[PDB]
Structure 1
């Protein structure tokens, strides 16, 4: 752009004798990042790019102290550091091209532009290795889940192609990466799942609960004569299934976080980070908070009725101090059903 020398070399022209080129060419792409002249498409179309006046220097890395940018011939790069910069330069010129320049004379000053056509395109990709291609520590590449670094060093957890149904898009690996890797596990990681997403919030997990109904279609409290069997089922009409509906409580103190844990705030964040990320169909997670006396509205109109079920919070009209309580429930993170029906056909005779 016109703006890139106009931002860099016209304003901040005091560090050019002591500038790092790796720093410099980074700040070039940060200078025009929106539709950048993307350096990967260099393999056909350096025409209409207008890159920096680096070539002709013969420099090693971060040696760029010379800095001359014209404005007129529709291209910045016109640099020939003469008698220095012998970057691989070994021998004199051959016979026919000296006769083309006649005779290694001041016409070489208009010939080095052609002659440096290779060293133009080489130090491009030499930089491209160092900063974007295979170095970047996932810290220079530093993208917004776009970089091939992220897609390589993230897919080992096992999310390629699965961009379906992820509302807050896949970026919160950054804590969960070792913890999502040990298989069939665990209990501890859910506390980290809280600690990332909101500070100051403390929690404990109880391993089992008295889960109830599931209502069964044969009632069987009348005996059979023809087919009456015993072994396991001792019950009446409702059953309790303990077996994997683990239970969580939370501990905050700041009403911002408390109204950050309203239905509306950050409650939907954990609801996403479970049901497609870490648990899926293993379990069901029951939620609860225990806080102080009341932070409560009134019974008015259309849509904020439910803190789940419970509603209180105007009976305190009198007392000057308070007490703690438990807050409410939030439902299991579930995914279930029956689809409808019964079938017609069969598998195989072997």
Structure 2
């Protein structure tokens, strides 16, 4: 592009005696990254690219130092430094070609344009291995869920295609990937999920808790004359099932994050990080919070009255200082149902 030297070499002509070639080609694609002259499109369409005047120098890596860019010939690379840069050059020119350049003379100055057509298309991809195609360390790639070193390095958790139903794409690989490689585990990863997302907040887990209802549809405590059973099913009218409904508390001390956990702020961060990434249909999770008194108003219209289920933060017109309280509840991270129906067919008679 015309903007590629008009940004770089017209303004930044102060470190070109000691610049790296590794650094230089990176800033070209960072000069116009919006719809860039993609280096992978070399395979048919090097015409109309206007790339940088590296080639014809015959230089190794990090030894491009000379800085001359024309503007009239509509393609900036026309460079041949004589007596230097013979990188891999062994024998002189053939017999019939010297008879057309006549005779390895001043006409050779207009011959290396065609002659270095081969070295132009190779030092593109020579660079591309060191920086994009086998190195990038998921750091020189630096993508936004496009760069292939992410997708090669994230399918070992089993998320291709499963970005569906998530309001964000897969971004929390940076810390959860060591934790998300052990199977069937754990409880202590939920501490990392909170300390990542908002510091100043701590987490404690109680493994079992007194869950309640599920109301059984036959009451089953009819005392039966024809047939009944004893061995396990003994109860009253509502059952209790402990087995899988853990309790989680949070504890903040910066009031800017207190208004982040009430629904709308950071509650959408946990509610999608659990349900499809770390737990899924393993368990159900209960949330709770403990702060000092509140910051909560009252009966204003359509939608933001409720501090979960409870209300407070409005009545103390008496005393100066603190009392600690539990805050509220948040909903479970559950997903269930029955669908409706009765059936019509069967499996197989074997």
Q: TM-score of the superposition, structure 1-length normalised?
A: 0.99
Asked if structure 2 preserves the Cα contact closer than 8 Å seen for 1:202 and 1:252, the reply is yes
Asked if structure 2 preserves the Cα contact closer than 8 Å seen for 1:18 and 1:65, the reply is yes
Deviation at 1:181, TM superposition (A): 0.8
Deviation at 1:313, TM superposition (A): 2.2
* Residue in 1 that maps onto 2:242: 242
CA deviation vs aligned residue, 1:103-149 (integer Å, no higher than 9, x gap): 11100000001000010000000011111101011100011111000
Deviation at 1:331, TM superposition (A): 1.0
CA deviation vs aligned residue, 1:236-277 (integer Å, no higher than 9, x gap): 000000000011001101110100111010011000000011
Segments of 5+ residues of structure 2 without an aligned counterpart are: none
Asked if structure 1 preserves the Cα contact closer than 8 Å seen for 2:298 and 2:305, the reply is no
**Count of matched residue pairs:** 350
Whole-angstrom distance in 1 between the partners of 2:179 and 2:334: 22
Whole-angstrom distance in 1 between the partners of 2:294 and 2:305: 16
Whole-angstrom distance in 1 between the partners of 2:315 and 2:137: 58
CA deviation vs aligned residue, 1:142-198 (integer Å, no higher than 9, x gap): 111110000000111110012211111111111100101100000110010001111
| SS at 1:291 equivalent | strand
CA deviation vs aligned residue, 1:7-61 (integer Å, no higher than 9, x gap): 1111111111100101100011000111111110101110010111111101111
| SS at 1:259 equivalent | helix
Asked if structure 2 preserves the Cα contact closer than 8 Å seen for 1:55 and 1:77, the reply is yes
Deviation at 1:83, TM superposition (A): 0.8
Asked if structure 2 preserves the Cα contact closer than 8 Å seen for 1:209 and 1:246, the reply is yes
* Residue in 2 that maps onto 1:349: 349
Deviation at 1:312, TM superposition (A): 1.9
Q: TM-score of the superposition, structure 2-length normalised?
A: 0.99
Whole-angstrom distance in 1 between the partners of 2:240 and 2:314: 36
Whole-angstrom distance in 2 between the partners of 1:62 and 1:325: 63
| SS at 2:324 equivalent | coil
Asked if structure 1 preserves the Cα contact closer than 8 Å seen for 2:286 and 2:332, the reply is yes
Asked if structure 2 preserves the Cα contact closer than 8 Å seen for 1:249 and 1:290, the reply is yes
CA deviation vs aligned residue, 1:200-239 (integer Å, no higher than 9, x gap): 1011000011000000011011211111110001210000
| SS at 1:289 equivalent | strand
Asked if structure 2 preserves the Cα contact closer than 8 Å seen for 1:68 and 1:78, the reply is no
